[PDB]
Amino acid sequence: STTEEQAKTFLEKFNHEAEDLSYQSSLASWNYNTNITDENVQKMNEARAKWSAFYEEQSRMAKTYSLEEIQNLTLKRQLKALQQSGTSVLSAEKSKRLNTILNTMSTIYSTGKVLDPNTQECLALEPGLDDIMENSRDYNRRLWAWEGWRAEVGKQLRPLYEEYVVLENEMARANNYEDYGDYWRGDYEVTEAGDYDYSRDQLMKDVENTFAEIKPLYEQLHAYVRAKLMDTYPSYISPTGCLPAHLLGDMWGRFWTNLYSLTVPFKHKPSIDVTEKMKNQSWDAERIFKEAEKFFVSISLPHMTQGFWDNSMLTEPGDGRKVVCHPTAWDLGKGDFRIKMCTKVTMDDFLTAHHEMGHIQYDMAYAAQPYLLRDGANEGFHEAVGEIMSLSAATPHYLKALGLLEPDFYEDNETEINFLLKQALTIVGTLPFTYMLEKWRWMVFKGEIPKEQWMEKWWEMKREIVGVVEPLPHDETYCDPACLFHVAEDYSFIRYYTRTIYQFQFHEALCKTANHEGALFKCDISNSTEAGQRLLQMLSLGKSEPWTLALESIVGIKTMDVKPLLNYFEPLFTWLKEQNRNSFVGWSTEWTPYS
Amino acid sequence: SNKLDSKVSGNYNYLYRLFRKSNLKPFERDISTEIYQAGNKPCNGVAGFNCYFPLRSYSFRPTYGVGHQPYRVVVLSFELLHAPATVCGKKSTNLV
Ligand SMILES: *[C@@H]1O[C@H](CO)[C@@H](O[C@@H]2O[C@H](CO)[C@@H](O[C@@H]3O[C@H](CO)[C@@H](O)[C@H](O)[C@@H]3O)[C@H](O)[C@H]2NC(C)=O)[C@H](O)[C@H]1NC(C)=O
Ligand SMILES: *[C@@H]1O[C@H](CO)[C@@H](O[C@@H]2O[C@H](CO)[C@@H](O)[C@H](O)[C@H]2NC(C)=O)[C@H](O)[C@H]1NC(C)=O
Ligand SMILES: *[C@@H]1O[C@H](CO)[C@@H](O)[C@H](O)[C@H]1NC(C)=O
Ligand SMILES: *[C@@H]1O[C@H](CO)[C@@H](O)[C@H](O)[C@H]1NC(C)=O
Ligand SMILES: *[C@@H]1O[C@H](CO)[C@@H](O)[C@H](O)[C@H]1NC(C)=O
Ligand SMILES: [Zn+2]
Numbered sequence: 001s002t003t004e005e006q007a008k009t010f011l012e013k014f015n016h017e018a019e020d021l022s023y024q025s026s027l028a029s030w031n032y033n034t035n036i037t038d039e040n041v042q043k044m045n046e047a048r049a050k051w052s053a054f055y056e057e058q059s060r061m062a063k064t065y066s067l068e069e070i071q072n073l074t075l076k077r078q079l080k081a082l083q084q085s086g087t088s089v090l091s092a093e094k095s096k097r098l099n100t101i102l103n104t105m106s107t108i109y110s111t112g113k114v115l116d117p118n119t120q121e122c123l124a125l126e127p128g129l130d131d132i133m134e135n136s137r138d139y140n141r142r143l144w145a146w147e148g149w150r151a152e153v154g155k156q157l158r159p160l161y162e163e164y165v166v167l168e169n170e171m172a173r174a175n176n177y178e179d180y181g182d183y184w185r186g187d188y189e190v191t192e193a194g195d196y197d198y199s200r201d202q203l204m205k206d207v208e209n210t211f212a213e214i215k216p217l218y219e220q221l222h223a224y225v226r227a228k229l230m231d232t233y234p235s236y237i238s239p240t241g242c243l244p245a246h247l248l249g250d251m252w253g254r255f256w257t258n259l260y261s262l263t264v265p266f267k268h269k270p271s272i273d274v275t276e277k278m279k280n281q282s283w284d285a286e287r288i289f290k291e292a293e294k295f296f297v298s299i300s301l302p303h304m305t306q307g308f309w310d311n312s313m314l315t316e317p318g319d320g321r322k323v324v325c326h327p328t329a330w331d332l333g334k335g336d337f338r339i340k341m342c343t344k345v346t347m348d349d350f351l352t353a354h355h356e357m358g359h360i361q362y363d364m365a366y367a368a369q370p371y372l373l374r375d376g377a378n379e380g381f382h383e384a385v386g387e388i389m390s391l392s393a394a395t396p397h398y399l400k401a402l403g404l405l406e407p408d409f410y411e412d413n414e415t416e417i418n419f420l421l422k423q424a425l426t427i428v429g430t431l432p433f434t435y436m437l438e439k440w441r442w443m444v445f446k447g448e449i450p451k452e453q454w455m456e457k458w459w460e461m462k463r464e465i466v467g468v469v470e471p472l473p474h475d476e477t478y479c480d481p482a483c484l485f486h487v488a489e490d491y492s493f494i495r496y497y498t499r500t501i502y503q504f505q506f507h508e509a510l511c512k513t514a515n516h517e518g519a520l521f522k523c524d525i526s527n528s529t530e531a532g533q534r535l536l537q538m539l540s541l542g543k544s545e546p547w548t549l550a551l552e553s554i555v556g557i558k559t560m561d562v563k564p565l566l567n568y569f570e571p572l573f574t575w576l577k578e579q580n581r582n583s584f585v586g587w588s589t590e591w592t593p594y595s
Numbered sequence: 596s597n598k599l600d601s602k603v604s605g606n607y608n609y610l611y612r613l614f615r616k617s618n619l620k621p622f623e624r625d626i627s628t629e630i631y632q633a634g635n636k637p638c639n640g641v642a643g644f645n646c647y648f649p650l651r652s653y654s655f656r657p658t659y660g661v662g663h664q665p666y667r668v669v670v671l672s673f674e675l676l677h678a679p680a681t682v683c684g685k686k687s688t689n690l691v
Contacts, residue, residue: 005633006633006645009614009631009633009645009647012613012614013613013647016613016651020654061644307660307661311658334659334660334663335659335660335661335662335663336658336659336660
């Protein structure tokens, strides 16, 4: 009679095998990275290959149904997620043409090639392509590295860019969807929720105010860099224009600390480095993980230590076999804790270790959710919760509580603003970079921009907001724009841009709800229990509900707000205003050294 | 009993029911070998739509979580009837 029993029977049967295969497929990758042998490749690659073929059989009949005759809104959400088509309807013939673009593109970008004119002298393997661009303070050396890393690497990527786009236009019509642009915007879709739904049209207005209101601070940061380096490098800097692309340090430009010694915010006071004393005290490497853990118990959860401290290694390769120790902490499955990291005694790595195992605390709470809804509310929440406390526990004031700081420490405010500045600039470094990339892609799929403008339009949007210009114009044979991050590596950035605004939101949500008073930039959550009880409210909610409900419970806002951001750096903003009371905060994008 | 009832490659012997017609009467067993059906259209031997096999394996492993380790259970039930109480628990002190 009722067709619901068919839906109920499918849901349980699919989950039981999938999570078993999810554990099995995962261990093949995790074991391979801990133990790299060719016999492990066979286990690793076959388990990936066999899982997908079985998955499709279950997913084909899974989406054979739809959101019909399901009065349960929660079950309807679970079904809605599994019913995504993707490549299920994609034909095999068009798939193959895509594989050629993908496999070649990644391999050819890693091998950077830079011509070394005049042959120099007898040369060894050294120096290396990565190293040469980072240490070069000479004008010719920096440009010589940069020109090769742009011109001679973009050439190989040009043939692969256009073929990938052509298929993007074609596959849309065979996948019952208009264009790829809706897919990325539909990631935050809420459907069939009265007085509570969220729409893709809303983000366009909200993101407009974020950049406009942050821009005055970024303009000061842009002016700050130029004014200080004007004294050291006046010849290679235009006071009435943009800045040469070679001065960013590297292709990415996310790291401004390479020339930190030439742009120290306060050189009058010597370097703040007081952790050397702790280095010779010979503390164990595993204590750092406990330091985060004992922080976590403060919010009144029990401890975790039995059966999840054996599957890991610290400080030692363990054999003549080599292990990659990139930071990759995933609970393999069914509560199996695992963390691979080269844990070393370092102030910077101290917060990193907090971040790494703090990822597990997220996973442990939501591990009870069924298979199809077991993850965080949005992409950027995960890394945010790890970072907010790691920065809080890495503050020198907290060092006093744990006794790490010197007993004779006198209250300093010069040190605080310097740390926040480097913390600020790294985050805001690439927001305008991804801003032009994310917005430019959307109108590409619309179809009002033809193929010819893939050179000028990419540069035009960048100059409007970012202000980066190549010193020498490059013709169409030369391929500068090809080095974008979504074709060169095809890694999603959506976990990064919207994360930062979520990070301020999570940072502000904890403090204001915990009766916190004083400075906004410093917040204390150790020795409190109210925050964690509210924390667990969505730390274990999961995706059984849209993220909108959790947003209203913790704070009470269903939209994204930027106003608190100005209060965060109130002491910092004063110093920036004081130093630039004479110069003009801004630049002319239209002026060029050529003309 | 994780240290003895768990196999590294897997313990697929242990099997538990997942689907049946209706609720069980207390103290009843369900060993009937029958494949569940929805609508009676699918027949035995061909299970492509709506037909599944309700007995799934626990698949115990030593690397699982505390709640995913096997925990043997022993249940005692006491019955008093019109019988002369043939089962009982009696300390006796030394005589003087
Ligand atoms: C969270 O709060 C607890 C309870 O206050 C802290 O434990 C206690 O912290 C103090 C301060 O470091 C430790 O030193 C004690 O100081 C008092 C103050 O004069 C002194 O009378 C004692 O003789 C002692 O030296 C104390 O040993 C420690 N434990 C207890 C049981 O009081 C805890 O440190 C706080 N944690 C954080 C992260 O704030
Ligand atoms: C890394 O993996 C290889 C498998 O490719 C391991 O070599 C096997 O080890 C097991 C148990 O030690 C033996 O029973 C096999 O005979 C070994 N060879 C093969 C081909 O499987 C190797 O021992 C692993 N590394 C470490 C440190 O244990
Ligand atoms: C909907 O499904 C959930 C399962 O999580 C259940 O708790 C709830 O009672 C169901 N509600 C209705 C109206 O069926
Ligand atoms: C560690 O170094 C500090 C300063 O560098 C000094 O007190 C001493 O050399 C070491 N401290 C010890 C051994 O307690
Ligand atoms: C800077 O911090 C110190 C810390 O003691 C204190 O004087 C005050 O909070 C700040 N001083 C300013 C902003 O002039
Ligand atoms: Zn991380």
